[PDB]
Amino acid sequence: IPLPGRQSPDHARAEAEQLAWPRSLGLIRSDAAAERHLRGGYADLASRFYPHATGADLDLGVDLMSWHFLFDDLFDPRGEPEDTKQLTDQVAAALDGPLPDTAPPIAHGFADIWRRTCEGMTPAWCARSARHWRNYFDGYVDEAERRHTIGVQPTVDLAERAGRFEVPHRVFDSAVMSAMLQIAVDVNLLLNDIAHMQNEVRARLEQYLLLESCLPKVGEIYQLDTAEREALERYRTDAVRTVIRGSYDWH
């Protein structure tokens, strides 16, 4: 992984306060569950996925890591299709509007993350981020019956929100960026299953660099102005690179 290791300078405060949010939302209800959460290193992981984030922006990324692992654990008999989809639909419902008070705590937790994720972003970014979540939830149903259950894309999406920028949407959809994001997903997929595959990681990372060098040309093809060029650069270094490197340094 020829990418620099990076960690937010606010990582210590974020890790110290990481329990207040899942406790106030009923996701963690016992001191033993709290300790098990602390042992995951989830704020540490967020501080590496989002080194450019501090304060409330990094707390949102910590909550997202917190929520994902609390959520994934709910499928460790339910995870063996109908019962899986019954939970996912209740969570995914938060994307379409307010949840009923009867919704399980894990769904009110996602809704609180999603509410904070969208505020201040363009509606089109929200809609696209919402589709990524549905693909994530659909992946759990498909697994019960991997590029979607890993949840790399919503992690990447949060890096944009935590950095208060948006990569130009027409470059997000580009064949080049789509190939870069696929590498990020595959690399995260291989490193997690390990925790020949190492060669596949090395080959993909070498291809990742090749794809990175096309981005100056991609920017002109889509006629990026100055701000859009800087957003694309922030996306390359603070969202894609960080989701590739941060996962490795975490393990």
Ligand X SMILES: C/C(=C/COP(=O)(O)OP(=O)(O)O)CC/C=C(\C)CCC=C(CF)CF
The answer to whether residues 43 and 19 touch, using CB atoms and an 8 Å cutoff, is: no
Judged by CB under 6 A, the residue of 8, 47, 88, 188 near ligand X is: 188
CB 172 to ligand X: min, Å: 18
CB 238 to ligand X: min, Å: 15
* Residue 76 annotated as part of some ligand binding site: yes
**According to CB under 6 A, which residues from 48 to 87 bind ligand X?**
64-65, 68, 72
Residue closer to ligand X (CB basis): 177 or 187? 187
**According to CB under 6 A, which residues from 118 to 137 bind ligand X?**
136
Residue closer to ligand X (CB basis): 95 or 150? 150
Q: Return all residues near 90 (Cβ < 8 A) that are at least 6 apart.
A: 99, 103, 104, 107
CB 46 to ligand X: min, Å: 9
The answer to whether residues 95 and 134 touch, using CB atoms and an 8 Å cutoff, is: yes
The answer to whether residues 143 and 79 touch, using CB atoms and an 8 Å cutoff, is: yes
Q: Determine the Cα–Cα distance for residues 188 and 36; give it in Å rounded to an integer.
A: 23
CB 217 to ligand X: min, Å: 28
Judged by CB under 6 A, the residue of 124, 192, 198, 221 near ligand X is: 192
Q: What's the token pair of residue 102?
A: 């009867």
* CA-based radius of gyration for the chain: 18
Map tokens 């789509």 to a residue: 178
- Pick the closest to residue 231 from 150, 122, 116 (CA basis): 122
Nearest residue to ligand X, using CB?
151
Q: Which amino acid type is present at position 2?
A: P
* Residue 199 annotated as part of some ligand binding site: no
Cβ neighbours around 154 below 10 Å, total: 20
Q: What mask, x for binding ligand X by CB under 6 A, covers residues 139 to 158?
A: ----------xxxx-xx---
Contacting positions for ligand X (CB under 6 A): 64-65, 68, 72, 136, 149-152, 154-155, 188, 192, 247
Residues forming the annotated binding site for Mg(2+)?
A: 72, 76, 192
